[PDB]
Amino acid sequence: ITGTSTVGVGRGVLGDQKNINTTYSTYYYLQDNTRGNGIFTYDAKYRTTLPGSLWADADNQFFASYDAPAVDAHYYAGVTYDYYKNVHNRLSYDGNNAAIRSSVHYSQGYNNAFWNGSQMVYGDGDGQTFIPLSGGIDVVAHELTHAVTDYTAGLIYQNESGAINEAISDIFGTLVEFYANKNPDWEIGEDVYTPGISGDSLRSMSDPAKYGDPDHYSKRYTGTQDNGGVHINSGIINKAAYLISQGGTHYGVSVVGIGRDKLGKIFYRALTQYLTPTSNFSQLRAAAVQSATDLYGSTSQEVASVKQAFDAVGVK
Numbered sequence: 001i002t003g004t005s006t007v008g009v010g011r012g013v014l015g016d017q018k019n020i021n022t023t024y025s026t027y028y029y030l031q032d033n034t035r036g037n038g039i040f041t042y043d044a045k046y047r048t049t050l051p052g053s054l055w056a057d058a059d060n061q062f063f064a065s066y067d068a069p070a071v072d073a074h075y076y077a078g079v080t081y082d083y084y085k086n087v088h089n090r091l092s093y094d095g096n097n098a099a100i101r102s103s104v105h106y107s108q109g110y111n112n113a114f115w116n117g118s119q120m121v122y123g124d125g126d127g128q129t130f131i132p133l134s135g136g137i138d139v140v141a142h143e144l145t146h147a148v149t150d151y152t153a154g155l156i157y158q159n160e161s162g163a164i165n166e167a168i169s170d171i172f173g174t175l176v177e178f179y180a181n182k183n184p185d186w187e188i189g190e191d192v193y194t195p196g197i198s199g200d201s202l203r204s205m206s207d208p209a210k211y212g213d214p215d216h217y218s219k220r221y222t223g224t225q226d227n228g229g230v231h232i233n234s235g236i237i238n239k240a241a242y243l244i245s246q247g248g249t250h251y252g253v254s255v256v257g258i259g260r261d262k263l264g265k266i267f268y269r270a271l272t273q274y275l276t277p278t279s280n281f282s283q284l285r286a287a288a289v290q291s292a293t294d295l296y297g298s299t300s301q302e303v304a305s306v307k308q309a310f311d312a313v314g315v316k
């Protein structure tokens with residue numbers, strides 16, 4: 001909508017207060033004009049017609065419980081935009097500041113979130129498996145990273161290329177969580193998953209096996225459910241990325257950690273310059289090795305650690 005840029009205030013899903021960029025024209029809208037072509041947040045009103053209505057509020061205060069998922073979808077899309085711009089010189093998901101659109105209150109008791117090819121969509125959860133999923137910054141950034149992948153490598157969402165697609169979203173979802181630096185970790189979705197259970201998450205990058213996901217190529221799922229295991233076999237790549245950053249010894253193979261920033265640079269370069277729609281795990285290893293070589297040199301510690309990490313998870 002055409003209007004003047006304003007700053008509202010509200011509370012997110014977890015009860016934290018934050019300021020949000022809004023737009024005023026009779027109503028205050030969740031329309032952030034400060035980032036690219038805009039960040040826009042919509043109300044799906046418990047239905048599945050998308051995007052729904054651009055979020056309108058009478059007084060620029062967003063403290064109602066119904067407001068909370070919108071506040072966080074809006075705010076964390078902003079954080080994610082800032083991450084890609086400041087850390088990777090990427091302007092929104094298409095690199096040309098495409099508008100970022102999100103819808104909240106999708107369906108009823110919907111225990112998921114997704115990128116639908118055009119926008120982000122967040123369920124409210126059923127209150128037992130999930131609370132509203134935009135409450136997790138790693139979730140928001142995971143979903144927006146699917147948009148980045150779709151505009152860059154274009155990894156096909158099945159089998160090994162799909163597992164890489166998923167892992168890329170977990171990796172950068174996690175790196176955005178560290179960037180915002182509010183109790184960050186190497187777990188996925190812990191802030192919105194099972195409110196009645198402390199200390200768990202949907203997936204773990206540090207130990208995928210904790211939730212039954214493979215941490216080695218020899219343990220890969222080869223069946224047909226979950227598009228050939230895209231959320232399952234992602235654990236193999238998530239573990240490799242974790243090892244590259246943090247180091248460790250895994251099935252007897254020791255990896256020297258090189259830290260999160262370099263992990264991010266190596267994988268962002270692989271994603272945008274080397275991976276293709278059909279890339280498999282072996283081809284990811286090659287892309288990561290060549291990316292690290294480009295950035296740090298063929299005899300660098302960084303290249304050695306990438307190789308160690310993929311060795312550790314049995315890839316090549």
Ligand SMILES: N[C@@H](CCCC[NH3+])C(=O)O
Nearest residue numbers: 111112113129202226231
């Ligand atoms: N996002 C993952 C986990 C969601 C679990 C929903 N109960 C998937 O779609 O497989």
Ligand SMILES: [Ca+2]
Nearest residue numbers: 057059061062
């Ligand atoms: Ca209000």
Ligand SMILES: [Ca+2]
Nearest residue numbers: 182183184185
């Ligand atoms: Ca956290």
Ligand SMILES: [Ca+2]
Nearest residue numbers: 138187188189
């Ligand atoms: Ca996390």
Ligand SMILES: [Ca+2]
Nearest residue numbers: 193194195197
């Ligand atoms: Ca929990």
Ligand SMILES: [Kr]
Nearest residue numbers: 007019020021
């Ligand atoms: Kr703001």
Ligand SMILES: [Kr]
Nearest residue numbers: 035036037038
């Ligand atoms: Kr944007």
Ligand SMILES: [Kr]
Nearest residue numbers: 051101118119
């Ligand atoms: Kr949209």
Ligand SMILES: [Kr]
Nearest residue numbers: 081084092093
């Ligand atoms: Kr982005």
Ligand SMILES: [Kr]
Nearest residue numbers: 138139142188
């Ligand atoms: Kr996620």
Ligand SMILES: [Kr]
Nearest residue numbers: 191192193195
């Ligand atoms: Kr939760």
Ligand SMILES: [Kr]
Nearest residue numbers: 212213214219
């Ligand atoms: Kr497994």
Ligand SMILES: [Kr]
Nearest residue numbers: 160163220233
């Ligand atoms: Kr795999």
Ligand SMILES: [Zn+2]
Nearest residue numbers: 142146166169
């Ligand atoms: Zn995903």
